[PDB]
Amino acid sequence: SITCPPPMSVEHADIWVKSYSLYSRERYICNSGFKRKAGTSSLTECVLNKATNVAHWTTPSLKCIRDPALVHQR
Amino acid sequence: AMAISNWVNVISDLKKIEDLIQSMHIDATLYTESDVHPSCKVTAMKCFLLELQVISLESGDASIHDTVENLIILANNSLSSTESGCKECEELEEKNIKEFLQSFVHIVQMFIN
């Protein structure tokens, strides 16, 4: 019956969590004007600290970068 | 001994990855250059390689990581032995994994001789 807390913030991204349930998989999405850096992942998962019975969201490797499409028109 | 191009082994690692992920549920969308211009092919290859790492990370799987690691080792090798005004990786269309890997095979055929 374990569930995760609200997820932590990722810079320039937002998240809407469909399920707070253990092992739930969710994704951060870069804000308008930003794009996920190639080779970084937006996935986060609700996981268990085994010898604590407390669950947390994994930190994604996601990095949100200014959209290169725009970086050229200012 | 016969010299076999690294890209051949890259192609068969891609096939191996395709088979291994069938059982799993990787649902990432990935930057995918579906029609690589010869003039930008190394830029494009580098994007494919970066985005393969996302499939690997998100998999949480030993065999997938080991296959991905072997693939990119093989690719970097070949790429050792200047393109200007090519799109950044993040300018590319994002596609599902299946289309991603199909287009990855396609670029690899460009590097074979």
Swiss-Prot record, chain A:
N-glycosylated and O-glycosylated. Expressed in neutrophils (at protein level). Expressed in fetal brain with higher expression in the hippocampus and cerebellum than in cortex and thalamus. Higher levels of soluble sIL-15RA form in comparison with membrane-bound forms is present in all brain structures. Isoforms 1, 3, 4, 5, 6, 7, 8 and 9: Widely expressed. It comes from the Eukaryota. Residues 2-66 form the Sushi domain. Disulfide bonds join 4-46, 30-64. It is found in: Membrane; Nucleus membrane; Cell surface. High-affinity receptor for interleukin-15. Can signal both in cis and trans where IL15R from one subset of cells presents IL15 to neighboring IL2RG-expressing cells. In neutrophils, binds and activates kinase SYK in response to IL15 stimulation. In neutrophils, required for IL15-induced phagocytosis in a SYK-dependent manner. Expression of different isoforms may alter or interfere with signal transduction. The interleukin-15 receptor IL15R is a heterotrimer of IL15RA, IL2RB and IL2RG. IL15RA also self-associates. Interacts with SYK. This is Interleukin-15 receptor subunit alpha. The chain holds residues 31 to 103 of 267 of the full protein.
UniProtKB/Swiss-Prot annotation, chain B:
One of its GO terms (biological process) is positive regulation of inflammatory response. GO terms for molecular function: cytokine activity; cytokine receptor binding. One of its GO terms (cellular component) is cytoplasm. Belongs to the IL-15/IL-21 family. Induction: By interferon-gamma. This is Interleukin-15. The keyword Transmembrane does not apply. The keyword Signal applies. Most abundant in placenta and skeletal muscle. It is also detected in the heart, lung, liver and kidney. IL15-S21AA is preferentially expressed in tissues such as testis and thymus. Cytokine that plays a major role in the development of inflammatory and protective immune responses to microbial invaders and parasites by modulating immune cells of both the innate and adaptive immune systems. Stimulates the proliferation of natural killer cells, T-cells and B-cells and promotes the secretion of several cytokines. In monocytes, induces the production of IL8 and monocyte chemotactic protein 1/CCL2, two chemokines that attract neutrophils and monocytes respectively to sites of infection. Disulfide bonds join 40-86, 47-89. It comes from the Eukaryota. Keywords: Cytokine, Cytoplasm, Disulfide bond, Glycoprotein, Nucleus, Secreted, Signal.
